[PDB]
Design a protein around this nucleic acid. Sequence first.
DNA 1: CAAGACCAATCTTTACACTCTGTGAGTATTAAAGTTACCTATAGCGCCAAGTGCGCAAAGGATGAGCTAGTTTTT
Lengths: 283, 732, 283, 95
Amino acid sequence: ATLYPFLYIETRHIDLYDWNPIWKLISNLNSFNFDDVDHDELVNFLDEKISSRKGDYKKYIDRVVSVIDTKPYTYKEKVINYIKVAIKGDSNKFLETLLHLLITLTRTEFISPIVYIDEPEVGLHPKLAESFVSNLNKIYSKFKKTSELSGPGRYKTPYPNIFYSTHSPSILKQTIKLFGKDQQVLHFSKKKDGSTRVNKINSTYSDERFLNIFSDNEARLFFSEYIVFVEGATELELFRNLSLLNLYPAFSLADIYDANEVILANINPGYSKASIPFVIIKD
Amino acid sequence: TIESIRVKNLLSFDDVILRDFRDINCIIGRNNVGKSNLLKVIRYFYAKLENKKVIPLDFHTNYNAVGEITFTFDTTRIKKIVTSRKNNGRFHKHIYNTLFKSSSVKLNFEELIARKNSTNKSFFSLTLTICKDDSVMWSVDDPKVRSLLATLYPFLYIETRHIDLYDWNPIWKLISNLNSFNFDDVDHDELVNFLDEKISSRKGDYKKYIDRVVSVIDTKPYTYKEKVINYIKVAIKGDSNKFLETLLHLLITLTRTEFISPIVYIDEPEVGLHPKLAESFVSNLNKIYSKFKKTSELSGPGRYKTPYPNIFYSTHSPSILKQTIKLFGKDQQVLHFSKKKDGSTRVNKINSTYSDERFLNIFSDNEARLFFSEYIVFVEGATELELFRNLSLLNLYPAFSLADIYDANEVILANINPGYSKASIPFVIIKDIDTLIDYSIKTEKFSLRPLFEKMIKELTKEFDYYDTGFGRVRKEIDLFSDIQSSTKKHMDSGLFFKRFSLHNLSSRINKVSRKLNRYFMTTTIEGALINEQSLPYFFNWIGDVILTQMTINNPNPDKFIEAMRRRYNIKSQVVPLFKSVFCIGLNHPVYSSAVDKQALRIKLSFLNYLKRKVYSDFNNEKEIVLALRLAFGGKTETQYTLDKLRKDGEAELFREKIKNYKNNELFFLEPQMTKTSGWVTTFLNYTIEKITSEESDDDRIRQKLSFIFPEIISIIEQASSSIEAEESSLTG
Amino acid sequence: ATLYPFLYIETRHIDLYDWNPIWKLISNLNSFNFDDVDHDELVNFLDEKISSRKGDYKKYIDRVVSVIDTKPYTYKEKVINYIKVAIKGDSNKFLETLLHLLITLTRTEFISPIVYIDEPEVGLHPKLAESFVSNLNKIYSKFKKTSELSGPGRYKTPYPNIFYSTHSPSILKQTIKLFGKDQQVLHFSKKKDGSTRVNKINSTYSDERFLNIFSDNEARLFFSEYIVFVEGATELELFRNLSLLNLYPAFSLADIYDANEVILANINPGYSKASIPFVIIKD
Amino acid sequence: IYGSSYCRLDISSFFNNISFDDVKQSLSPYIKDEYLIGTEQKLIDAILNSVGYESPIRKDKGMIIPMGFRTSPAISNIVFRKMDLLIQDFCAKKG
DNA sequence: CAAGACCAATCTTTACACTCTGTGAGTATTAAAGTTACCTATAGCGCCAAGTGCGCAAAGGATGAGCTAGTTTTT
């Protein structure tokens, strides 16, 4: 438990006034022993600095303690107080700060936390949702050391595992385009008799052009119950007719996509066939 | 240090003024709405002082157009501090320019010297006005004055019913605002360097770690209060009743070296607490209060002459009130809210300072309970308690059960002084006619007691002008003074009166003294219990006592009864047989049918013998009542008892006959003949049960009780009418 | 106030247990007077139906009332009780039911409420949001009475005004495609010195082909700070290069769209220019 | 006592200038509108006939409520309540 | 003629001085760190020196060309 901590974040009902996860992450991920700080020396130093008459602050603190006698500080509370006195300050911003702090502080320790995040895009503009993933990728790539990219501040240390629960194609598009080989997509679905499944949807593309021209339409296919692949725009015009689909309330649940041979090869619909059924129509 | 709070035309206030505050001000009453309204008014005023946007309060009536809140602050200590030539600082000069500058430049060179620098007390008045269009106006148009007043006289409110023990915000607020240290001289860099030096394997590691953390967590900089709170937390070694105790102790301790005097309000300090816990809380508060007091010979380091802050309590527990009265003494006051006739909150002061040390030491929970009452009945003896607290009697009158009865003497009444809180707690004092007039046998003349003289002197009012309807009181007073001699005649050898009846005089003195909340009974309690109309019920009760309580002493009833019937005569020697056969016992065994019949026959014979002797020896049927009410420690007509008659050596024959009756036949009744024995309760219960069995309707039984017992029923009815008259005002 | 009621709905923090808005909407929108319902007659009817001995149910009711005495029922409370005793039962489903009830219970009255809805798509699958919009459109079209569409159940009464606060392109796409002439899009933005503006973005398209082939890419342009229009795939490939955009963190905030002359005419970016700046690059 | 500047004003002929119709209008809301005696005299008029008087020396002004009667001060306060409210509202804004 | 009603912000916030460490009765009595703080904006036209200017307003060729300027309101 102490070597592989688990963190859970829910942005739906997150409280901005509570900073407990941040303090827990900072206190757990430290490389100092605070038992050597002592107490008499620090109090004497503060008394000498702040009091004109020698012996004012110490007597004040003793008088306060004599009438507020409670349980002694634990080690975690003591280190939190030291960190707070050593720093200059106390929804999306909270999550970004947590992720950045975790990535920065995991670079010099063998502790490997695992984090789960639920709905990172609640009440978030699409531009902000993209910027979140962009900032995460930038801080991820800042510390990476590989061959030529060597020097101080660059490390060879495994990164913590991050799990996302999203309903927005923007975050999926950003994480597919930026991370690349360091991401995967999971599809749950259900069985006939009723049972949760787990499948992997292909998200790594060898073609660079496909990854560059990746857009919202490509990301929309991941949230499709039934995909119809066509080639020309006339098929799109015919199968997206509102009047025609008004009389058939069963073909409106399927999405139609213009696909070429190269696009079909890159997407590879056959891999995730049990999760997302598809049909390819040709001449 | 507020002195006066005035509220006009707001919420449930028409014109309410509170002054003469002490350190341990306590608030009690039945109208909780008034207390809530006062708290809301204070909070609204202090929120408007600090420039906060809040909803204006409502008006009591819409036939006005303004609502005013007035506050007076005693700015005496601050003036002495600032005006001294020794103090040269920014804050002192700013305070002078803000508070005492405008009012001092308009005075000449005569009023300033030797007229305002010796013993005068300085006051500052601030008025807040709310208009009909929800507009707020101040009497002083300067935000700096309001800010300085707010920061010099902070207000703290504590609610104990809904309090979170995980939040210490009030504690940190008190600590941060009651310190004499400037925390801006502690540089961040040097402290960080010190911490890095203390804990490091390589120099600079802690500083680099802190910089890396700050570069990611960059947010708004710390305020001054946050910095001082962090410094206090790192300095200290650790972090419902306990929270309140800590707050009070910190408030008392930290204000001994500051010129800031906070005001604290606490609501329900005893919620979910043992009575011992509340008593210990008050005792600890008093001990800490007395620890820092430097008066007269008590001196030395750690003792100060700095004034203490003001504390207000809202409590419903007699224990806290008792402890506050006993411990603090002259440094506390009690407030009572109540209502008015048309509906409006009042404020009155209840006396709580006593000059008798015995009364303070003997103070108990009954005295505190007297505070939480709407109608108090004061009596002298212990028989009045037994009569007025009967459950069966109070069952039929659901209006006298709302009054509390207390035993008080003259000194106790003087110490309590019920007349001060007359408008808040109505009361009635019931006494006997013997306390005013004393009668003698050897000398045929009445005499007046000093209490009667004091009442006459109080009723007499010199330094007055003529008023129609006041001459009758003077005539009555003159008649009372001239009735000092009042030669009369007593028949039956100083036992009865020729024609006085002691009734017209009692009625006249009651009419005169009704204005002083007094009532003088014609006779004693035992006299009213047994009267000429209650003889059948008393005889039935005696017969029931004989039938039930008397049992066979011998374990075998049949053999003993047969032996005593064959040994003693059934008719001539009935008294020795009754004395040697039947005895009073707690347990009543059940005998055989023949034994039960024999016992019933013997009891009936004894009853017939006693009734025949009673009706033969005495004829007028009034001497029977006199003997009955005199044997039960009582006096009648002439105001004489057994001991008084024996000392006076009068009515030898009557006393000898009573002694013969007591020591010959009614030997079993003797234990239930002394004062405070318990015969009153048994007789009342038996009579009420009999009348309930006879008559089913409540009106019929009440009428029969009124007929049998006129005086006590009249007293109960008068008290009930008085309660019903003031029921609306003294009820939340 | 009683002729033009205002109803505000929030979905991020909504309690499904509470049904007060639904009961208020039903009570306000009715054409019945409940003052003539005799209490004694109903009590006698219930007593006769439910009891074997006559009058015991009335005795039970008066025994209960004599001990639970309190303030009498107001008109609204008794109306709600009468409605509940006649019906057989009491996030997205709540909103859909409220909208359907509002539309149904206003076709026979002259009261026109004003509805505001905040975040209709919070924690919602894109297909679910599209289905919600489609159901609303079908409910609207059921009661429409225009030209030959005449008969019972079809009315000429005006519909209430509904305002949406959305961050999802799916809802915007569906409301543009379905409602058409009966919808508008507002853009707030901000001024230079700091002040909130209000502008109208064009959303009515005369071309039927453009509206039929409307997709997520077209809806993405509504959330763009800067639009760059191109007329070829090569420009898209050049302007979407990740490595090139890495060195210029100012051009990554612009959206590049491939449009034709007819597409440009249909979109008409010049109408909304102060809100969404754009540039058209040609040869 | 809380003020620094003081001003005093007086009303000329306060009781003689009280209009009778103003009194009737002021007292109307507190008296039921009905005929006390048949269909000739109303309850309000019957009550109000006990407070007015036709002054022989002031026949030009009609009938007025005269000083020296028992009910005059209460009627004056009731009539002047409206003016008191107006003046208080005016003075509140000026402090 | 003279008259109550004479703007908002000017950076923010806080705080005892002393010899005595608990206490102070002036003839007219705030300041000093901390943190920002940010600032910023331009035609007639062309030409060569590329904005700091020069020339010309006839081409063009260094001083013939020669030319104009909307409504309404305050006023």
